[PDB]
Amino acid sequence: HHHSYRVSTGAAHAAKGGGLVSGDSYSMMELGARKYAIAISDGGARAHFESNETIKLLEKILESGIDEKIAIKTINSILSLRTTDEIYSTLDLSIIDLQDASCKFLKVGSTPSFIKRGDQVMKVQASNLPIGIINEFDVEVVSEQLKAGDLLIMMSDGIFEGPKHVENHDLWMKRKMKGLKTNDPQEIADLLMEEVIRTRSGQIEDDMTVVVVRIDHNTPKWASIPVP
């Protein structure tokens, strides 16, 4: 009934041309008992109902205990159905188990997620499943074991691709995450945003969005620290 881990979260979001409403969507929600779920998507009132619904489906498959290849082709089937061509939407989705700190990620697109553990910053990525096996949406499904203190950073394509005069976007983000010293999720969100906006001198070509989640021990409020 009491969870061993807890989550602290932050989020920054900007719109095209310094606008007031963005078309990036994100959500971070408890998802039943012991899980916690983070999602970002790019690509209407009814639209965000259909999205949340497909996200719910993808959630349940991700959590089903199914082999990763099967999940991949199942998810492709789901997406082919209830999607058209001429819709090129992206989705990064991560779900943390709040008892063991295990985590399942699912990626559709070319925008990378990252874990920061101390001074390492790992890009979370899956292999191309072998040739001859089709993958219509280049869906990726990765499982990692997290530890307390870990940062998880997820971003929209607009912010990943945002830094001007920068050829390797992956490596630029990597560096900028390495260079942070704060462990605050929200400070980290806002800092990353400012670094890419600084690079384009204030102009905002796309909706830009990043969420950060720190993973902590769920230590009761009344606890005191112990000493050496």
Q: Which of 1, 4, 8, 2 is nearest to 215 (CA)?
A: 8
Tokens of 28: 């971070």
Alpha helices in the chain (DSSP H): 45-62, 68-80, 157-160, 169-178, 185-199
The answer to whether residues 125 and 142 touch, using CB atoms and an 8 Å cutoff, is yes
**How far, in Å, CA of 136 to CA of 59, rounded?**
19
| DSSP at 16 | G
Tokens of 182: 């704060």
The answer to whether residues 108 and 139 touch, using CB atoms and an 8 Å cutoff, is yes
**How far, in Å, CA of 71 to CA of 106, rounded?**
10
Residue entry with tokens 């489906």 = 57
Tokens of 19: 């606008």
Q: Where are the domains of the chain?
A: 1-228
The answer to whether residues 12 and 212 touch, using CB atoms and an 8 Å cutoff, is no
Region of 36 please: left (phi>0), alpha (psi -120 to 50) or beta: beta
- Is the four-CA dihedral 51, 16, 186, 173 of positive or negative sign? positive
Breaks (C-N over 2.5 A) in the chain follow: 43
Q: Which of 113, 183, 112 is nearest to 148 (CA)?
A: 183
Q: Which helix (H) or strand (E) holds 35?
A: strand 35-42
Tokens of 166: 């920068």
The answer to whether residues 103 and 94 touch, using CB atoms and an 8 Å cutoff, is yes
**How far, in Å, CA of 161 to CA of 110, rounded?**
10
Residue entry with tokens 């990064």 = 92
Region of 22 please: left (phi>0), alpha (psi -120 to 50) or beta: beta
Write 56-63 long-range contacts (CB < 8 A, 24+).
58/91, 58/93, 58/106, 59/31, 59/93, 59/95, 62/93, 62/95, 62/104, 62/106, 62/141, 63/35, 63/95, 63/104
